[PDB]
């Protein structure tokens, strides 16, 4: 079944608390639908993880290089997260044509894109998908289980999750998916990414996440 | 005194330095000494006002969502995050100052952005970048705590930021360095630079030896 023409030019923006499973789910999608999606390679000033390569998951740059690019107008959006800078360059999106663009960004980037996308020529109409953990306890077990972050970074990431989840609870994302069972969540992501009939209503109710557990 | 040098009127003076060094203190005296000469760029920030601050004077105080909407709409010449809050210079804030010489109080990320962005404006913008240094790390800490407006967590973030700010400053790339030791001495140098009076390019200080490990 082919990708819906009505979503090919609508970038799919996936966001959610660190550790929820964004990278893991995207890998299942690209395996299930090869040569269909383009993953936007963001710039970041954080250091690479063992499984990461420069030019694959991120373009890893220094803070001075990052801010030079910002001043040069190279970024569609950028923001600071957990003490490091991240952003989507125009060139990273251009590199993905003609596949449907997929971006993995956080809330400040989402807010920028909601303002900026209508002002592009031609206007861009992203789809904003929020990927939720099934519980805060599972979020913490996944984030610590990944084993790539310092204790200081985990604290910053859990603190950021408070504002990310607070915004998510306002109901403004286009689709919500709870990443409980990987296969069930992956099937929903595939439906959303392919734009198949029913994708807008294929999503989940946000769980009752008491944010005080993030303290 | 003599009028402002025409050669610097259209060169924005960008002042930066570690939080607590004395930027606001010195600028307040500069503007009282030279009224109707300078325009102070009113940045946007998402931090909360301090007791002695008024919306529209020191800052345009906005929410984070308002700030990011403005960013996405292209309203900012530069912006950055500092100490967990956002700050930025809107194009409209500088337009509001013409024809006065623009004075900006921004941090290092904004400086780096402007160094890349100013040459690309039409016409090109040629700022003067001034670094204001504390005389010692111990005096930076006592000034920052003595102001009495920040939480302990905010002080920690500001001192941590000072490490990167001073590391960059030590590279020697600023146009002028002024050590804020004696307020009157530093004020005279700042006025000379802001007015562009003869000698301003050579009036600056050598950056002191500052042990950045003391910031912890
Ligand atoms: N549905 C799931 N069930 C169990 N573990 C999962 C699931 N999804 C992801 N994980 C694991 O959780 C951790 C965080 O996933 P990751 O994709 O790195 O998150 P993110 O990109 O959102 O920060 C990884 O160790 C990953 O293998
Ligand atoms: N030269 C100086 N000597 C002693 N204290 C100073 C001096 N300059 C400023 N201060 C004090 O240090 C504190 C920080 O000054 P401020 O102007 O608010 O710093 P900044 O704007 O760089 O963050 C204030 O309490 C101020 O009165
Ligand atoms: N705004 C923005 N956030 C990004 C970008 N790239 C990654 N992020 C976000 O930064 C956070 C941290 O990513 P990580 O360090 O775990 O790879 C995640 O929420 C991720 O979505 C980007 O290009 N822009
Ligand atoms: N980049 C940038 N930094 C700013 C701006 N306004 C204030 N800052 C910087 O933010 C830091 C904190 O400012 P404060 O909270 O003490 O007023 C200072 O270093 C100040 O120069 C702005 O418009 N842009």
UniProtKB/TrEMBL annotation, chain B:
SUPFAM superfamilies: P-loop containing nucleoside triphosphate hydrolases. One of its GO terms (cellular component) is cytosol. Transmembrane segments: none annotated. One of its GO terms (molecular function) is ATP binding. Residues 10-195 form the Guanylate kinase-like domain. Keywords: ATP-binding, Kinase, Nucleotide-binding, Transferase. This is guanylate kinase.
């Amino acid at each position: 079944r082919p990708i819906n023409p009505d979503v090919v030019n609508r970038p799919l923006v996936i966001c959610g608390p660190s550790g929820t499973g964004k990278s893991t789910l995207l890998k299942t999608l690209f395996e299930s639908q090869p040569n269909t999606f383009g993953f936007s390679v963001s710039h970041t000033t954080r250091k690479p993880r063992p499984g990461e390569e420069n030019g694959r998951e991120y373009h890893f740059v220094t803070k001075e290089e990052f801010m030079e690019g910002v001043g040069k107008g190279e970024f569609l959006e950028w923001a600071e997260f957990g003490g490091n800078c991240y952003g989507t360059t125009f060139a990273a999106l251009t590199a993905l044509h003609p596949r449907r663009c997929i971006l993995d960004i956080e809330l400040q980037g989402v807010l920028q894109l909601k303002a900026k996308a209508p002002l592009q020529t031609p206007p861009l109409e992203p789809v904003f998908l929020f990927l939720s953990p099934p519980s805060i306890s599972q979020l913490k077990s996944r984030l610590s289980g990944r084993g790539t972050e310092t204790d200081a970074s985990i604290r910053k990431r859990l603190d950021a999750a408070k504002e990310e989840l607070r915004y998510a609870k306002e109901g403004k994302y286009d689709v919500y998916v709870v990443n409980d069972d990987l296969k069930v969540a992956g099937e929903k992501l595939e439906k959303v990414a392919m734009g198949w009939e029913g994708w807008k209503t294929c999503g989940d109710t946000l769980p009752e996440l008491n944010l005080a557990e993030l303290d």
